[PDB]
Amino acid sequence: HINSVSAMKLSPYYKVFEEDALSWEDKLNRIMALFDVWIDVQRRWVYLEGIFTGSADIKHLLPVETQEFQSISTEFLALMKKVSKSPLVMDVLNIQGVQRSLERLADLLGEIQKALGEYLERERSSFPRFYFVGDEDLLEIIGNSKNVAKLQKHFKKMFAGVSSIILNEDNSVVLGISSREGEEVMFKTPVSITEHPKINEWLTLVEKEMRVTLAKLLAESVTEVEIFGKATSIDPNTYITWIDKYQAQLVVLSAQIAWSENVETALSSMGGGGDAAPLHSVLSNVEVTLNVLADSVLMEQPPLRRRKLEHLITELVHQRDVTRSLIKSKIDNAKSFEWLSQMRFYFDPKQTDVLQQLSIQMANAKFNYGFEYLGVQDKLVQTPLTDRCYLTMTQALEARLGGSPFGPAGTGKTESVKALGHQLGRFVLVFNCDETFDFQAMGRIFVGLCQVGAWGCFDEFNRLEERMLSAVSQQVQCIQEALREHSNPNYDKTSAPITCELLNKQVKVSPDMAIFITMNPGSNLPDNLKKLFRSLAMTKPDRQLIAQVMLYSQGFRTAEVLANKIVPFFKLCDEQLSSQSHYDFGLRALKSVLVSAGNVKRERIQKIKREKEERGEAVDEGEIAENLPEQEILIQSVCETMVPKLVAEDIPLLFSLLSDVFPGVQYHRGEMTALREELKKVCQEMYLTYGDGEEVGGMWVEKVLQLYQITQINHGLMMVGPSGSGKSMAWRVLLKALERLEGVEGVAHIIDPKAISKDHLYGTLDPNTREWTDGLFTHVLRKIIDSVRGELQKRQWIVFDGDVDPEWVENLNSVLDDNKLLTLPNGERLSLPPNVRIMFEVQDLKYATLATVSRCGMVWFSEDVLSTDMIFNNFLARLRSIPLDEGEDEAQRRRKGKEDEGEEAASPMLQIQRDAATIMQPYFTSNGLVTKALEHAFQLEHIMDLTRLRCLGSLFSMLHQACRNVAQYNANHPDFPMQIEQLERYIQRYLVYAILWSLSGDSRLKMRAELGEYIRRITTVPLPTAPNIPIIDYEVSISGEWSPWQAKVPQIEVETHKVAAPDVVVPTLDTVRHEALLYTWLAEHKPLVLCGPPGSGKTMTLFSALRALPDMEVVGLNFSSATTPELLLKTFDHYCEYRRTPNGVVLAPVQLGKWLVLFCDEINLPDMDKYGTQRVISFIRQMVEHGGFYRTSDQTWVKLERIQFVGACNPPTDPGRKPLSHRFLRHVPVVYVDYPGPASLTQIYGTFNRAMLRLIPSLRTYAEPLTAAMVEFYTMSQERFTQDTQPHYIYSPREMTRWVRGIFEALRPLETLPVEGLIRIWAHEALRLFQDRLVEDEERRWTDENIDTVALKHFPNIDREKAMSRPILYSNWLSKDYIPVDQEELRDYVKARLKVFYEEELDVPLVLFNEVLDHVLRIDRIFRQPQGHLLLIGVSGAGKTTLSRFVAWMNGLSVYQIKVHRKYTGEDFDEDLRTVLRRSGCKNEKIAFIMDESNVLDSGFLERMNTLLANGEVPGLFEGDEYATLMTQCKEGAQKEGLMLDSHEELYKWFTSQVIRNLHVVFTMNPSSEGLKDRAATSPALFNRCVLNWFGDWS
Amino acid sequence: VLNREVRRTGGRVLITLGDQDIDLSPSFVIFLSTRDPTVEFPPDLCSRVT
Amino acid sequence: LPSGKNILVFGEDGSGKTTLMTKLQGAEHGKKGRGLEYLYLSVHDEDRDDHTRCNVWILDGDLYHKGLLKFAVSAESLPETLVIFVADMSRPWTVMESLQKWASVLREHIDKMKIPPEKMRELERKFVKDFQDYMEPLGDNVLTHNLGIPVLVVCTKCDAVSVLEKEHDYRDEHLDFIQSHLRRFCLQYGAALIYTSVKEEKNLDLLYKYIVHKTYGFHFTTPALVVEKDAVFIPAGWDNEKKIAILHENFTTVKPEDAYEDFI
Ligand SMILES: Nc1ncnc2c1ncn2[C@@H]1O[C@H](COP(=O)(O)OP(=O)(O)NP(=O)(O)O)[C@@H](O)[C@H]1O
């Protein structure tokens, strides 16, 4: 408004309104001048409120600010109350002195915020490590100064290894620190909190005492280890006692100090004499220590001592290598470079200060050890590359330059920098640079590093974006310049307070601090820091030596050969195996595999030891370890860790590579007899095949065993096979088998994560009125944690059965990591108990982050784990024991009987289906008819992707219906039931019929014939013996013999009232076939889906077949791009209801004994997410497959009872459509409704035309000759014009119905006609429906000739000149009747009306030429028809949007045009459609709904219009009170029209009829040059629904 | 606006722009500009501009 | 004391519903009427010198009349409602059929009230606490059905046990099998169980004191009584399948898993 008034000041007509404008300008400015202040006074207050009431101790720290904030809050609350009593903007502005009061409040709140910031900065500077802590965290720390336990979680951010502080029972004295691993350092002098109450003071004392005690313990450790250094033999017990007595860090430091001092004394002693005995003594002592450690590590040790032993071995191997190198080089002076270049440790206990006692030297560099506790860190194998890294990095630090180890990913760069920093005892802080780069703390973190003294390593600094890179580069440049200022010699450091400009303050920089920048080439460092940073190429780490040292650390006798074998093997696997995201042959995987191999070796030592001990034997750990194959342990570990992840295509290649690298060594799988027996029992119980390996079903048994192994090892795992590989069945079988094996109850919580929103999944915090609402996953976790019903005793697995995406797994990363902790925005930290196992099922991990894949184990369920034979066996086993009619009441009784003795004849249905299985077994064999048919069908192309289980489920459902039909015949013939001969013939024919309709049911007619020919070639069952009829055209009667479908399709007569809208489908061959299949697949409650080209007739056939059934209650839902689970939930709330039962909450329809079936007219159309999944499709999938869903509001499982789904679609090739998920297409059987063809069209339109000609009784005899013509020419057009030539040359039976409607409207007012007039109307409708859409003139000439040819062929002896003259025109303006008129009279009338139109609505001349009068007549004709929608396509300009308006004005149609805004959501389009529909139907006001490509930029809203174009009513628009208001207005309109209606359904039908009659849609488009638009070529459904008119360009 | 699709209602001459229907003042003139000389405009805009 | 408190009384006709509630009202002659009967109990707190009323609504035995519950309780008054299921001990072979029939009818009514699921979960969690917060004057084998509202099963005419023992050959095993089934049903609804006779005046004061205790917070000191076959009293929160399993020690011809209608 302010900008618009300022612009109005420039208008030439502004002088008249000037004074008024100025007044508003003042008010407008005042309004801004108020609210610009107000939001500030709000924000700070809210912020201050969040600080001054969340912590109760802030009152004591800041009393004056607390009092000022109290006095401010009272005034602000009063002002807000006054505003609440009058929320109008103008009323608020006129409050007396609001501006000055708000300015005072802004000033005082700013002052208090400044005081709080200064206080927090003072607290940070008092204890510098708080600079690594955020504002809220620091406030929590200081506020909870007396509740020390709350501080325990923040130490991991401030200290390097301190995870907590050990405290006295009253929490008044700090006794020590503890690490994550539980290693504890007990202070020599405890820190007394009571004497130093302030948090900063006692935290500083804790840091000081940590350093002092670490130094004092290192002194004793070195003093003790000096004895081992000078001893010829080491007693293992004393060495282990020394290792236990001291921490890992001090242990490794003591070893390094002793070795360095011993080598220094040796080199001093040799002193130019050339006597190498002292270095030989040092090497001997190192080798003796290595032998002692190697013997000790094979034994069973506690985990912490095992880590200490591994660290000592890793250090002593490097020490041995260095001493051997020195002996080989004949170094004979301590100042030789070969000794100086090796890192050296000089401990001076006599130094009084405790931060300059240990000095670490390397070449020039002379660092001091900062005694920061690091816990039990992971040591690094000191390869020559890491030695080079240490040398260069220390050289750069000595020169005060920065470090830049650059190289490819996973080469140890950041880990090497961390190891170097830890070796010198300096706190390292790695900053990740992958979408987790918290900038707002980065300046604070830099200030903390500068003040406290600590290293910082940027992992992959290249990955920062350009703005982020430049800002961080500037900050690091300033820090590096401040550091380089130290190096100059002139600056005397007696008084040298170095400073750097950070966050607009002079921050003192300590010399110990340093910064490192890891980089990934492909590249260079930023130009700011190229001069200040030394770069090192860490291109290729030494795999062989790392493997050697690690394998030696685990106690392997042979490590050189094993390392030299395993290392090339991993690279061989990386190259040869097919590239997949989940494969990981990096060094982390290799080290994990080697640790697993060490664990397996130790397990074997313990197994052999206990096995011998149960017998009579003498035991020694070393002797047992000597005679074992290390290669067998290593290959076993490699296979156990890799094969579960291996795809079936890659497993034999992996075994070939393993045989090549490890010759003559084979991995025999560990035998699990008990679990295999339980698997056999459960598999027989659940009708599943079981095999002992290399049999039918061996691979699946192996995969479930691997799943058990991964569940045992990891606390999170995934199954990532393709759809239909048995992962969900395998997991269910495993849970039910461990139920028997371990006597522990298995509970499953299956969640579809993508169906539910993330907010409902993890629970959302209310932005106001703070209260927590547990999400579904959080609800389950809290339920198990509380254990009200003893859930801790039970074992529970959570299975996320849905596609994995980055968005919903962010919170789950903390749980899946080693932390095992769910953190929520509420601030609660849920600890996952050991009983929980978070599981995943995904068809693929295409959109899964590597962070998610790394944390979880995985078992790839390749599609060739479930053979066809296994599924056939499952089907035949289900048939023999599951009664097919008893349903779900007897499902529970299946578990009551372990064998069901005496229940073989449970019902006659069981006997009939058992006999049917006996007839069907020969055809289900491994090389039977079904298998060959399926293999051939996989070759055939299908519009939808052909999955094996979809076809197999369709076939099984059809056979189920076959046996049901036999049961029906037996019921209808109680005197003599079905004989086995008739049963044999019937099921043999039915199996072929079902094979065709299951496999080729998704293909065209020609390919159905092809599959029929192949079956006829390979089958033994007799087939129909009629040559020119496809097999699919035949049905199998209840008697075995075939019978054509044509016998079962009646010839009906339609009323003249409904000739073009008999929603009851005219019975045709395709319709009877499809309703038969519809009943067969609805008997099993499977979700049917039908695909086909637009206008094929799927919607009508589905509706008619569904409504024919008595029980079915149809709910018509139409899907769109914006449809979500909310639509289905709303529909359930409307028609269905939730009721509680002891089994659980059950959703059921309100009407008892009726099956509610949901029609989803366009299943394909919903938009995929960014990760290629449709939410509503996944929701429907979970409903149909799990038989229920989770009420999110209650977070509880509910089960559908009488709910079904049946969908329609266009093929996925069409532009607006998308393919469906393979986990979803498995359940649904898809039928392809192609176009009816000549015979079906002739029959349907014969019925329609016989109905239409009833008006005039002299032309009944000409019904059948006309009907062929309407078909023949139409088919000819369908053969001559295709979508390839132009995108809109689409034909369907909708054109034929439009033809029938046009002739019907022409003939309805006419009392009588001659045959020639009927031919003329037929030709006119032909031209108006087909000749208009054409683009090229010669095509129009061809249509002109062909109309005459068809007419004279089917109407002989009728003279062409009278019947059809070329200038054919029909118009209603000249005369009240729709009769032919001359060109000149119409020209004169239109010219007069156009001259009128010039001075009525728009004053622009409009010339009438020969090619625009025709368009006027066409537009008028489409306006007169019912459901008449026009699509004018043509060059820009040319009259469209000007002729449409003109004809609309002439015919009195009020023009409505949509006005799309930005943020014009689908609800706004819905409201506009509601308004126009109310005007058109209730008020009976004709409307021309004009739409243009400019405002039709979004295709999302153009699929809501398709329902209107096809049916005239869009269900779901008026839901709610709008339905009541529309019903009231509709009945008022009906009373106005003179019809008295009561029922809402009849009133809605009349409203729909009125909308058909009145509302018209005029689309205007340009030719197909809009590729850039989302429409591209708009959907062929839109072309089919409207009547297309090619405007062209002026001749 | 380039096509001058004025809708006349009494003295109010509206033109649709987004949600709003704004009054075309007589003095209004617009000049479109392009610094890029390598552009392929749609045929919709070509008929609406010189 | 709070006003507007309600008691819903359910059970077969001839069970005792009107006679029990009339006697608790201190009245000799309550007028019986087909459909939905109404009366009120006068409640006085002697420690405070204050007095209130409790509404009592009694449903007819015919399921045709279940529509009338809309005149007794609403989505607003359900938190202030106590439920009484009346079991006829002179017809024990109809007790489990009656209790399942009436609990289902009440649930079918609660589902129709469309109570906000958050308020229903508040009442459900509060009732789980009001049941676990029991102790004689978490762990679970209870509340499968979890009505989530106060529930009391009142067995009426328990003096008729003295006729079942003489005319139908009933024994301690039949009475304990009836008591175990009643207690397992009470666990499913988190309910209390009380045995009463208006003819022998058994447990009438105990029933009044328990009703006023759960409805108005009055002090209560009576422990569970499980030794007297015709005077049993079990407060909501006292029982569990282990306390029920002691009754199975008296089983010599029936099992803990056999159906109620096969034996009774
Ligand atoms: N057997 C039939 N009898 C009568 N009309 C038929 C028949 N088969 C097809 N039609 C006509 O075919 C046209 C298409 O009908 P409809 O069922 O709406 O197609 P559709 O495939 O559902 N359109 P869509 O849902 O967008 O894919 C209508 O004009 C029908 O009248």
Ligand SMILES: Nc1ncnc2c1ncn2[C@@H]1O[C@H](COP(=O)(O)OP(=O)(O)NP(=O)(O)O)[C@@H](O)[C@H]1O
């Ligand atoms: N037959 C005609 N004689 C004279 N002027 C005409 C004629 N047809 C159209 N015009 C003028 O041509 C201009 C543009 O016509 P119009 O058909 O509205 O463009 P358009 O087809 O709507 N372009 P677009 O909406 O983007 O597809 C207007 O100024 C019309 O007055």
Ligand SMILES: Nc1ncnc2c1ncn2[C@@H]1O[C@H](COP(=O)(O)OP(=O)(O)OP(=O)(O)O)[C@@H](O)[C@H]1O
């Ligand atoms: N061991 C088995 N023996 C025989 N048939 C089996 C076996 N395991 C699974 N099947 C069959 O395979 C079908 C698919 O297996 P499952 O139900 O585990 O689905 P899935 O592979 O996870 O597939 P989706 O992607 O559809 O969820 C099962 O319904 C059953 O018909």
Ligand SMILES: Nc1ncnc2c1ncn2[C@@H]1O[C@H](COP(=O)(O)OP(=O)(O)O)[C@@H](O)[C@H]1O
């Ligand atoms: N010389 C080495 N000795 C031991 N382990 C190493 C060595 N080099 C690399 N690794 C391992 O390889 C992994 C490489 O990851 P990291 O160094 O964190 O990032 P990047 O190597 O991609 O910069 C580390 O986890 C580390 O354990």
Ligand SMILES: [Mg+2]
């Ligand atoms: Mg699955």
